[PDB]
Amino acid sequence: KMAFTLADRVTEEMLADKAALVVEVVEENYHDAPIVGIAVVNEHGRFFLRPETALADPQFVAWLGDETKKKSMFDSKRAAVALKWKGIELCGVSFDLLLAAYLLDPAQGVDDVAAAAKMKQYEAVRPDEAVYGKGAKRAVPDEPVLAEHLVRKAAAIWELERPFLDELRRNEQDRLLVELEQPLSSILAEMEFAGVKVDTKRLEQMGKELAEQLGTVEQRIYELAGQEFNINSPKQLGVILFEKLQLPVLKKTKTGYSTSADVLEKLAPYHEIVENILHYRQLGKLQSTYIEGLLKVVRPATKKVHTIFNQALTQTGRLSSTEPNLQNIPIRLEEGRKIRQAFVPSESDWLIFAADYSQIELRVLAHIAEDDNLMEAFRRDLYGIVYGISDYGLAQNLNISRKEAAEFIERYFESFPGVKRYMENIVQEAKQKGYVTTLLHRRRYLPDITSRNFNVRSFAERMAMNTPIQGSAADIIKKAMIDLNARLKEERLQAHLLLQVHDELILEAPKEEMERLCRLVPEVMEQAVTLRVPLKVDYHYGSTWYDAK
DNA sequence: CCTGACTCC
DNA sequence: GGAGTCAGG
Numbered sequence: 001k002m003a004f005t006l007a008d009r010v011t012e013e014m015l016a017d018k019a020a021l022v023v024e025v026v027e028e029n030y031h032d033a034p035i036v037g038i039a040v041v042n043e044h045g046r047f048f049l050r051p052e053t054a055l056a057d058p059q060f061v062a063w064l065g066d067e068t069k070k071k072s073m074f075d076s077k078r079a080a081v082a083l084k085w086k087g088i089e090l091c092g093v094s095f096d097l098l099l100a101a102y103l104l105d106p107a108q109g110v111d112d113v114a115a116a117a118k119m120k121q122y123e124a125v126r127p128d129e130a131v132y133g134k135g136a137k138r139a140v141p142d143e144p145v146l147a148e149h150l151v152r153k154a155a156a157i158w159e160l161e162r163p164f165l166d167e168l169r170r171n172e173q174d175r176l177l178v179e180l181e182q183p184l185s186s187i188l189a190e191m192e193f194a195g196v197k198v199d200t201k202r203l204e205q206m207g208k209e210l211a212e213q214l215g216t217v218e219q220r221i222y223e224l225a226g227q228e229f230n231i232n233s234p235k236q237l238g239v240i241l242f243e244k245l246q247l248p249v250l251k252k253t254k255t256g257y258s259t260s261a262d263v264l265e266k267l268a269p270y271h272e273i274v275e276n277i278l279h280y281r282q283l284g285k286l287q288s289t290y291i292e293g294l295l296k297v298v299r300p301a302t303k304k305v306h307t308i309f310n311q312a313l314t315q316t317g318r319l320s321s322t323e324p325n326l327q328n329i330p331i332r333l334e335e336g337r338k339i340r341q342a343f344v345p346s347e348s349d350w351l352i353f354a355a356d357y358s359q360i361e362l363r364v365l366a367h368i369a370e371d372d373n374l375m376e377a378f379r380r381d382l383y384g385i386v387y388g389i390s391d392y393g394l395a396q397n398l399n400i401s402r403k404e405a406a407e408f409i410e411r412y413f414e415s416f417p418g419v420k421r422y423m424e425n426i427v428q429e430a431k432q433k434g435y436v437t438t439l440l441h442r443r444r445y446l447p448d449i450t451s452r453n454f455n456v457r458s459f460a461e462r463m464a465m466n467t468p469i470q471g472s473a474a475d476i477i478k479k480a481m482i483d484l485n486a487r488l489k490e491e492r493l494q495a496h497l498l499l500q501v502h503d504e505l506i507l508e509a510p511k512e513e514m515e516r517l518c519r520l521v522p523e524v525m526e527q528a529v530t531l532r533v534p535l536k537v538d539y540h541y542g543s544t545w546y547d548a549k
Numbered sequence: 550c551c552t553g554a555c556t557c558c
Numbered sequence: 559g560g561a562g563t564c565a566g567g
């Protein structure tokens with residue numbers, strides 16, 4: 001039971017200075033995607049608008065871009081970007097229910113209005129998947145069924161804003177939402193829409209040469225193996241290694257023999273085929289993911305790739321990057337690192353600028369553990385612990401004796417008693433409170449932390465150790481991003497952000513601005529928050545992302 | 550569609 | 559510790 005007006009045209013009462021707004025983009029990847037419908041809920045009533053009509057209306061477009069007309073939405077970035085592709089600016093977004101839900105509890109995995117409403121027992125709205133359907137059945141339903149959904153979603157947002165803000169305020173997270181995540185969302189929207197330009201000629205040439213080399217390595221493997229098999233099948237590979245060649249089985253998973261990189265490396269003294277296999281799988285991933293996969297999503301006319309930064313997914317407060325993922329482009333082996341030569345500025349006589357925090361997580365450990373020996377070390381400017389590594393895990397990682405690994409860790413805690421203290425204290429806090437928190441009050445709940453089951457419990461305790469560290473770094477670089485764009489905009493530099501990579505920011509700019517960026521960027525990033533230790537940032541620029549080192 | 554690869558922070 | 563994509567099955 002909910003009345004609404006199926007409008008044939010926009011009226012003045014639709015354009016109030018506060019509204020719940022739904023700009024519906026049904027395709028998961030919203031870049032250049034259709035807007036299938038619009039809904040507005042305000043003091044005056046509920047309205048559905050056809051996008052052809054509304055978006056072609058100069059008064060509705062004006063309202064959309066008016067910062068003083070406040071909108072409450074769910075996933076405003078999706079809307080803001082889809083509107084950019086329609087040549088329309090979205091302003092005045094004051095509340096995002098997606099981001100509010102994420103801050104309240106990231107484990108709920110809220111990705112539609114219905115799921116957010118569930119957190120307040122609000123039931124007068126359907127899940128999106130139930131309206132549109134799954135997979136090949138996915139479709140926009142008949143207008144009256146569509147219109148009712150969009151309106152119900154707007155009505156839900158309208159009624160849920162204050163209950164959500166009230167709870168955020170109770171948790172002291174309202175500023176985290178309004179001053180950080182919400183402004184970050186607009187910045188991410190800008191980055192996504194700008195995209196990153198790709199040198200397809202170079203990428204395609206790399207692909208051709210990689211293909212030849214895969215063939216050569218492939219044949220060499222079959223020769224060493226004494227047989228042809230699918231190297232990309234862990235199962236067939238297992239038979240070759242552990243049955244035909246009779247190499248030792250160092251690890252098994254629930255499906256059979258492990259052929260992990262760690263395991264194969266340890267088998268190098270037994271047979272020279274394992275090294276070749278490792279090489280083959282490296283090359284094949286470069287080809288399948290960073291040449292072919294990347295070329296598939298390049299927009300041919302502009303040669304740009306447009307990632308989507310998921311702001312409400314990770315359990316720690318980090319972003320993730322999808323379709324394509326630009327936060328896992330190779331760098332560690334020169335062979336893969338060369339992929340970065342294909343990422344270039346979007347304008348002639350521009351350069352790529354790259355700035356990275358040095359050891360941000362170990363410094364956060366220092367700051368939050370208040371370890372003197374660790375803080376003193378950073379003031380002189382002089383990881384496994386941070387992930388809760390065992391003696392076993394460390395022995396294996398370093399391929400050394402466990403006794404020696406265990407002694408390394410025991411020594412470590414003896415040497416850093418304040419870190420050892422933090423670890424014990426943060427776990428105890430998690431057990432007492434049921435959640436851990438970050439510098440800017442991001443939380444993660446850990447309902448398993450008192451499980452009687454050793455493995456379940458242990459994993460939870462490790463999360464208690466790590467999340468405040470990783471999450472606090474996420475908080476910092478996010479703050480650094482918001483401040484940076486402000487510092488860029490005032491002094492009207494043309495430079496703009498392209499990418500964030502966890503503890504790194506990647507920009508493009510006219511070559512003329514490099515000197516000013518060498519000053520501005522590292523400063524802003526270091527002055528993002530003030531810790532007990534100093535924040536350090538390294539920076540480079542160059543003709544391509546590769547050269548920015 | 551899941552698992553186990555390789556990739557980053 | 560936190561992520562995404564890919565091929566095989």
Ligand SMILES: Nc1ccn([C@H]2CC[C@@H](COP(=O)(O)OP(=O)(O)OP(=O)(O)O)O2)c(=O)n1
Pocket residue numbers: 169172173174175176177439440441
């Ligand atoms: N209503 C609030 C209050 C705080 N915060 C987040 C944003 C910044 C961070 C700092 O909190 P402050 O009040 O400025 O410092 P504090 O009180 O000393 O924080 P803490 O309780 O952790 O010591 O917390 C928030 O999101 N919403």
